[PDB]
Amino acid sequence: APDVSSALDKLKEFGNTLEDKAWEVINRIKQSEFPAKT
């Protein structure tokens, strides 16, 4: 059997740490409006 029913607690933590931080940066860049054209 696959570990799918026992191998998602790890990845869930991966999108939890640094990930939530990346979104936390959207508040430090979105407030500035990040108008820097590309």
Q: Which two tokens stand for residue 36?
A: 């820097």
N-term to C-term CA, the chain: 48
d(CA 12, CA 24): 17
Q: Which two tokens stand for residue 17?
A: 């740490």
Cα–Cα–Cα angle for 29, 34, 28, rounded to 5 degrees: 10
φ and ψ of 27, to 5 deg: -90, -20
DSSP annotation string for 1-38: --GGGGSSHHHHHHTTHHHHHHHHHHHHHHTTT-----
